[PDB]
Amino acid sequence: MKIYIQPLSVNSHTVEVLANSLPKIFNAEVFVLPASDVSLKCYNASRRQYNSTCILRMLPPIKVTLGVTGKDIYAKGMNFVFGEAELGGARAVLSVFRLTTADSELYRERVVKEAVHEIGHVLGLKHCSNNCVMRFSNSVQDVDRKPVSFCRECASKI
Ligand SMILES: [Zn+2]
Ligand SMILES: [Zn+2]
């Protein structure tokens, strides 16, 4: 397994956080692609947010590719989403916009958790109701409450 991180209008510190943590978590080689701007094609001026599905569909469909953006994103019927993944597919996107915080260590943990979550989906995992990174999070407060680790059931499936 290899993971390709596509920076899209996100600071380089956030990228380095994922580059350094993902490899051990997934026993995969991680590659950072040249940064680029998130495409204005995906911008929704009315909402001042980018559409997560539109961003996802512009990434190369190469398992596993994770786009990471600093911009706030939404999906159809959602105020906002933290991200979006192709379940059992190739691509996912993560926005760190809703995750920002002046507590640098907390921010690091949130970024890693939600990246791990999205990649879990790419690897075929659905939402989990155990104490598990694959738990759905309604808000960042919920992100803070779930662990960065897969429960024994989810770990056995990947
Ligand atoms: Zn999810
Ligand atoms: Zn689980």
Residue numbers in the entry: 1 to 158
Which passages does the manuscript contain on this structure?
Consequently, two different crystal forms are observed, one triclinic and one hexagonal. In the nat-AfAmzA::citrate complex the catalytic zinc ion is penta-coordinated in a either slightly distorted square pyramidal or a bidentate tetrahedral geometry by three histidine imidazoles as well as by the carbonyl oxygen (Oβ1) and hydroxyl oxygen (OHβ) of citrate, with ligand-metal distances of 2.0–2.2 Å. The catalytic water molecule is completely excluded from the zinc environment. In the case of citrate as zinc ligand, the S1′-wall forming segment has to move to avoid steric clashes with the pro-S -CH2-COO- branch of the ligand. This has also been observed in a citrate-bound crystal form of the related M. kandleri archaemetzincin. Besides acting as zinc ligands, these carboxylic acids also mediate a new crystal contact consisting of a salt bridge between one of their carboxylate groups and Arg152 of a symmetry-related molecule. As a consequence, significant differences are observed between NHis-AfAmzA and the two carboxylate-coordinated nat-AfAmzA crystal forms. On the other hand, we detect upon ligand binding opening of the active site at the S' sites.
Archaemetzincins are metalloproteases occurring in archaea and some mammalia. They are distinct from all the other metzincins by their extended active site consensus sequence HEXXHXXGXXHCX4CXMX17CXXC featuring four conserved cysteine residues. The overall structure of AfAmzA resembles those of other metzincins, consisting of an upper N-terminal domain (NTD) and a lower helical C-terminal domain (CTD) with respect to the active site helix α2, which harbors two of the three zinc-binding histidines (H117EIGH121) and the catalytic base Glu118. On the other hand, as the homologous archaemetzincins from Methanopyrus kandleri (MkAmzA) and Methanocorpusculum labreanum (MlAmzA), AfAmzA exhibits a second zinc-binding site located in the CTD immediately below the catalytic zinc binding site and close to the eponymous, structurally important Met-turn.
